[PDB]
């Protein structure tokens, strides 16, 4: 086997962590660098390949893509790390007062017995014009090279019963640290959209903990360069409808995904297969650099999204496709 | 890379080479 993947041992968490972060462009205004979500099955996809110089130029091409449930995500804190001779050293993190039940729940292993007294005497540290709070912001604003944001999943929106929000650090590649903080100041408690991190037709890498078996498996793996096909939004009906097909249907197959629910909010559709399995948390980073290849230049024209039920077999797409073929039966009339 | 320790079998297998050079000169 491969030597570099040693020790082949258990990951620390269900949530694998972003080892690297994208560099910096100081000319840009402030931008997030990554985003989190949950793996949700595999779907078949067809489109015409507008790749020049190709043996499959302009022809129809069929490929399996994974959909990842990515809800809008909420800031609860900002962090400042100083550069040291010894690397990096978070000198201060600072939070946002109005924390949700989901975030607080991350601070208790036993939520039921608890007196739920968590960010409380810290919330009374907030209760004034600022003073102590605005001090610790100025602390960061003075020193510290990289400014990272504390955020958590909106898991109540999720069709998962795990109920306990995941915390993940995501840094900021917007230039000047004065801007960095004065972007995190305004964006405390505010929910952050998925389409405001990634567009369609983009290369991204993904992180996830791998499908455990019986030691074998259950390692953190990062795959690199994967094209986002579709960014959909939960408020817009007909996600399955392309510019071609245009029949009103959701990307969710008839009766939800395999061991995963209805997709009642925003999602990402990524080329090929993300590591791990459905339910697992994945964090998507924006590829560290600019990989200008014709593999990355092409803007895709999706044709049709296979929304057949993968549980068992799928001969049809919508419930409207069952009774147009069957007609009408016993229990109906 | 080569070493710079003389192993004792050599360090004394030099003396027993040097002794052979003594009896060679006389004859």
């Amino acid at each position: 086997g491969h030597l570099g993947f040693l020790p082949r041992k258990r990951a620390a968490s269900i949530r694998a962590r972003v080892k690297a972060f994208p560099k910096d462009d100081r000319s840009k205004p402030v931008a997030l660098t990554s985003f989190l979500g949950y793996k949700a099955g595999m779907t078949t996809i067809v489109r015409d390949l507008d790749r020049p110089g190709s043996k499959f130029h302009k022809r129809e091409v069929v490929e399996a893509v994974t959909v990842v449930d990515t809800p809008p995500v909420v800031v609860v804190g900002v962090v400042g790390y100083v550069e040291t001779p010894r690397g990096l050293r978070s000198l201060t993190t600072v939070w946002a007062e109005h924390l949700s039940d989901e975030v607080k729940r991350r601070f208790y292993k036993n939520w039921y017995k608890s007196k739920k007294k968590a960010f409380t005497k810290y919330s009374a540290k907030y209760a004034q014009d600022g003073a102590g709070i605005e001090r610790e912001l100025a602390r960061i604003k003075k020193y510290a090279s990289v400014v990272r944001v504390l955020v958590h999943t909106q898991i109540r929106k999720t069709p998962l019963a795990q109920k306990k929000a995941h915390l993940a650090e995501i840094q900021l590649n917007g230039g000047s640290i004065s801007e960095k903080v004065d972007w995190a100041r305004e964006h405390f408690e505010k929910t952050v959209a998925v389409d405001s991190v990634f567009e369609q037709n983009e290369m991204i890498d993904a992180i996830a903990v791998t499908k455990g078996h019986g030691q074998r498996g259950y390692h953190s793996r990062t795959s690199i360069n994967h094209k986002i096909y579709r960014v959909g939004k939960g408020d817009d009906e007909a996600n399955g409808a392309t510019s071609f097909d245009r029949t009103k249907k959701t990307i969710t197959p008839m009766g939800g995904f395999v061991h995963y629910g209805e997709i009642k909010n925003d999602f990402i559709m990524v080329k090929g297969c993300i590591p791990g399995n459905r339910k697992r948390i994945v964090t998507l980073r924006k590829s560290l650099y600019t990989n200008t290849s014709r593999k990355a230049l092409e803007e895709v024209s999706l044709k049709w999204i296979d929304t057949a039920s993968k549980f068992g077999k799928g001969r049809f797409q919508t419930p409207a496709e069952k009774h147009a073929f069957m007609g009408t039966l016993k229990k109906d009339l | 890379r080569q070493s710079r320790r003389t192993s004792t079998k050599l360090k004394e297998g030099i003396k027993k080479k040097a002794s052979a050079h003594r009896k060679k000169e006389k004859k």
């Binding site: 840009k28 205004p29 931008a31 997030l32 305004e186 964006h187 505010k190 929910t191 952050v192 959209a193 389409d195 405001s196 991190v197 990634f198 567009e199 983009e202 600019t290 990989n291 200008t292 290849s293 990355a296 230049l297 | -």
Partner: protein, 52 residues
């Protein structure tokens, strides 16, 4: 044959860097400054539903 760490593909994928996919990020960067900043304005509407 050339490696990934060879001098050929390193020079080739250095010239093309300043293409479209530095500006497509900037085109999306405004949507971060638009709808996400509209989330600041939408919650300011509900705060004016509470201040009334």
């Amino acid at each position: 044959a050339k490696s990934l760490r060879a001098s050929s593909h390193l020079n080739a994928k250095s010239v093309k860097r300043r293409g479209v996919f530095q500006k497509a990020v900037d085109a999306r960067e405004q949507r971060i400054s638009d709808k996400l900043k509209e989330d600041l304005l939408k919650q300011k509407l509900e705060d004016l539903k509470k201040k009334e």
